[PDB]
Amino acid sequence: SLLTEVETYVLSIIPSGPLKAEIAQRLEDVFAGKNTDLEVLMEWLKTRPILSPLTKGILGFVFTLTVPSERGLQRRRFVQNALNGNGDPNNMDKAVKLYRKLKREITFHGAKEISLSYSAGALASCMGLIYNKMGAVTTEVAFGLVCATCEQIADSQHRSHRQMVTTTNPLIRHENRMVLASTTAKAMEQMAGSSEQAAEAMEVASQARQMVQAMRTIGTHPSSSAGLKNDLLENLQAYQKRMGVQMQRFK
């Protein structure tokens, strides 16, 4: 069940969207013996616009571990660029210290357990060593290094959400609502359901998007109005809930 456990950590860091569905479907193919040619897979991976270079690096890295027949594959540049760890010497010293301990393990958990003791920076650098063949560790350990990195990123992915919503600055909190509404509105428009709900869903989605932009145009500063900041948010709250129920309707 290692292939399932790694798939949890890897897919956690990827942002939600059509790519996440496409990436996960790709992971199943290469985790189920349906391995397509690596080059066309990675070439498709490279062109993806939304993924961050670091996140794009891990997905490229994980594919290489599955495909057999080394010495005939190709080490993609963007993976090396992403995983290089900024070329820092100080953190890369920790990476070697990690890689010393990883070489002695063969169990996936043993790699993950020791890896999480080190900073998120070192794992990216150390994970570069395995990809570049500078080091060499068994496949089970290498995933244990990926999950330690993916868990570290995934932890900060969640910790950022907790800090952003509980922020005390009112200005961004208002700004958080409009962009959040726009993103939720964007979610329906891009996913056009087969049923007639797509037309209705697009309308309500376009309604919020057409209205949120007007809300930004008026603004919500205390000095930009005389109490209009209050009622402006209220319509958004209704619109957010209006879009909230709309999601499960086509479900």
User: Of 75, 97, 107, 206, which lies in the binding site for its own copies, with binding defined by CB under 8 A?
Assistant: 107
198 near its own copies (CB under 8 A): no
For 31, other C-beta atoms within 10 Å of its C-beta total 17
Of 31-50, binders to its own copies (CB under 8 A) are 31-33, 35, 48-50
Q: Binding of its own copies at residue 210 (CB under 8 A)?
A: no
Report the alpha-carbon distance of residue 211 to residue 193 in Å, rounded.
23
Among 96, 186, 198, 202, binds its own copies (CB under 8 A): 186
- Cα-Cα-Cα-Cα torsion 14, 21, 176, 190, nearest 10 degrees, comes to 150
121 is a site residue for its own copies (CB under 8 A): yes
Q: Is 64 in the site for its own copies (CB under 8 A)?
A: no
226 binds its own copies (CB under 8 A): yes
d(CA 175, CA 170): 9
Which residue, 54 or 73, is less far from its own copies as judged by CB? 54
d(CA 121, CA 84): 10
Query: Which 130-169 positions form the footprint of its own copies (CB under 8 A)?
Result: 136-140, 151-165, 169
Residues numbered 11 to 30 that lie near its own copies (CB under 8 A) are 11-12, 15-18, 20-21, 24-25, 28
How far apart (Å, rounded) are the C-alpha atoms in residues 101 and 103? 5
Name the one residue in this structure whose structure tokens are 């056009």: 192
- Residue 79 sits in the site that holds its own copies (CB under 8 A): no
Kindly state whether residue 87 participates in binding its own copies, applying the rule CB under 8 A. Answer: yes
Q: Which is nearer to its own copies, 160 or 206 (CB)?
A: 160
Residue 115 as a binder of its own copies (CB under 8 A): the answer is: no
Structure tokens at 191: 């996913």
CB count, 10 Å around CB of 41? Answer: 18
Considering only CA atoms, give the Rg of the chain: 22
**# binding residues, its own copies (CB under 8 A):** 117
214 binds its own copies (CB under 8 A): yes
User: Any idea what DSSP says for residue 138?
Assistant: -
Q: Which of 215, 216, 186 is nearest to 202 (CA)?
A: 186
The reply on whether position 96 binds its own copies by CB under 8 A is: no
